Amino acid sequence: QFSPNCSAVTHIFQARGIDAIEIPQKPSNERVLRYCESPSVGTCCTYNMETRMAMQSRQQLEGHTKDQISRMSGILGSKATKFKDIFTALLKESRTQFNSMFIRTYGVIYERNSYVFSDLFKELETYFANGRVDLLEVMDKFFNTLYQKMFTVLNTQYTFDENYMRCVSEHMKELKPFGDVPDKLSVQIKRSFVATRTYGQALTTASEVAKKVLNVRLNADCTGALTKMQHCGACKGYTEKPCTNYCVNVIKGCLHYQHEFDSEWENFAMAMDKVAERLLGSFNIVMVVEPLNIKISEAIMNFQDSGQDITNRVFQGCGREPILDRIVRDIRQRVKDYKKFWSNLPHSVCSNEDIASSSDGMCWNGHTIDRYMHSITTEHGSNPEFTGNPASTKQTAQMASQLSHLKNAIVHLRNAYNGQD
Numbered sequence: 001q002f003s004p005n006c007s008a009v010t011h012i013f014q015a016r017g018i019d020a021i022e023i024p025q026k027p028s029n030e031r032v033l034r035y036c037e038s039p040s041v042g043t044c045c046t047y048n049m050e051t052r053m054a055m056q057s058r059q060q061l062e063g064h065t066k067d068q069i070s071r072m073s074g075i076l077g078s079k080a081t082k083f084k085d086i087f088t089a090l091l092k093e094s095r096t097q098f099n100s101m102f103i104r105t106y107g108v109i110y111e112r113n114s115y116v117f118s119d120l121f122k123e124l125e126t127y128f129a130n131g132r133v134d135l136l137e138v139m140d141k142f143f144n145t146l147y148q149k150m151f152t153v154l155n156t157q158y159t160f161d162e163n164y165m166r167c168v169s170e171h172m173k174e175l176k177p178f179g180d181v182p183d184k185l186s187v188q189i190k191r192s193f194v195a196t197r198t199y200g201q202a203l204t205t206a207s208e209v210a211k212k213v214l215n216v217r218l219n220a221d222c223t224g225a226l227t228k229m230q231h232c233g234a235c236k237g238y239t240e241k242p243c244t245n246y247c248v249n250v251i252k253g254c255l256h257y258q259h260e261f262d263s264e265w266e267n268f269a270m271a272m273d274k275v276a277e278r279l280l281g282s283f284n285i286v287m288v289v290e291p292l293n294i295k296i297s298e299a300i301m302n303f304q305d306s307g308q309d310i311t312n313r314v315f316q317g318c319g320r321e322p323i324l325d326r327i328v329r330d331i332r333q334r335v336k337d338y339k340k341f342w343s344n345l346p347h348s349v350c351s352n353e354d355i356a357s358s359s360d361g362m363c364w365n366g367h368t369i370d371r372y373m374h375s376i377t378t379e380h381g382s383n384p385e386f387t388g389n390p391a392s393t394k395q396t397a398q399m400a401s402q403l404s405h406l407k408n409a410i411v412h413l414r415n416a417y418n419g420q421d
């Protein structure tokens with residue numbers, strides 16, 4: 001082509017931290033630049049100027065992504081902690097209100113068997129804490145104990161002080177003294193606790209795996225493409241900003257190790273929104289305790305119609321909005337905000353003061369001040385600004401465990417949404 005105009009870009013180099021002593025007044029005829037082009041017509045940059053601007057671009061990109069990722073990780077992590085603390089306190093406050101409510105209502109006959117209810121609450125609190133509880137198993141044993149006690153006081157005419165009660169326990173497993181009320185209540189409680197715990201646990205893991213992405217350093221191939229995009233325009237005497245799509249393609253390649261992680265992050269956000277829909281609707285733990293007295297009345301009505309029938313079959317064979325909804329809505333909206341977080345990073349990087357790429361028109365496309373031919377790439381394993389795969393084997397190996405944990409939480413969210421187990 002023709003010799004570049006180094007006088008038009010002398011202020012740009014000084015703005016990048018390069019002292020005026022290092023800045024060549026006339027184009028340099030040496031051809032030793034690693035990232036910019038060194039044509040026969042010369043260049044306005046030296047090897048030391050290129051190295052300074054190279055490490056500057058890598059630190060600006062790593063700084064911008066570190067601030068974005070850690071702030072998202074911190075917010076989601078603290079909201080998960082607030083969610084768990086609210087439900088944990090709501091659980092303990094319920095055990096007391098439930099005990100006080102039934103003692104004033106049913107009296108000593110409840111307080112005599114209050115241990116059956118406190119043991120159930122203890123299992124429920126333990127499940128939400130560590131998840132090592134079979135909820136349906138605990139619920140079935142809960143009603144089985146109620147089935148046994150309801151059989152003794154019905155037959156106050158007889159004496160059942162014997163430990164032949166195992167036959168009653170074994171026979172009450174297949175019988176339905178209260179109708180379908182215990183089974184319907186056991187499933188709705190199990191679904192609610194699984195969805196509630198998984199919602200907070202998946203949000204915590206997403207915050208943890210997001211924080212671990214900070215451990216992945218940019219590779220040498222990223223440094224080359226980054227400097228050609230952001231700084232090498234001034235080395236040809238050009239003052240225009242890089243083209244937007246050109247900048248986006250470069251940052252996408254620098255951050256290409258996040259490709260799979262970005263797509264699964266969207267799956268995580270969609271599964272979180274489904275569970276949040278359940279928690280605000282059918283699976284809401286308030287929806288199973290608000291109509292609790294009518295469920296008891298139906299159980300008693302079913303026990304008065306089937307009591308004489310079951311006591312004979314046993315002898316045969318024996319002888320204005322809740323704060324829980326507020327934190328769920330808060331998490332749901334913020335997870336909705338961070339849905340496209342990873343694919344938006346290249347667009348976020350290309351919009352700051354450090355790069356400030358031009359949306360055009362006249363912009364630096366890597367070679368000249370002309371139109372950028374390529375479009376924003378969406379491929380997995382290629383990029384127009386990179387020779388081979390922009391993601392190195394070392395980067396994807398660091399992302400492997402974070403990808404596996406994120407996918408693991410998506411399976412639990414989907415299972416919790418359907419409620420099957």
Ligand SMILES: *[C@@H]1O[C@H](CO)[C@@H](O)[C@H](O)[C@H]1NC(C)=O
Pocket residue numbers: 005006007008009
């Ligand atoms: C080179 O840049 C200087 C600095 O603005 C300017 O004065 C001069 O006219 C430019 N030369 C050409 C040929 O455009």
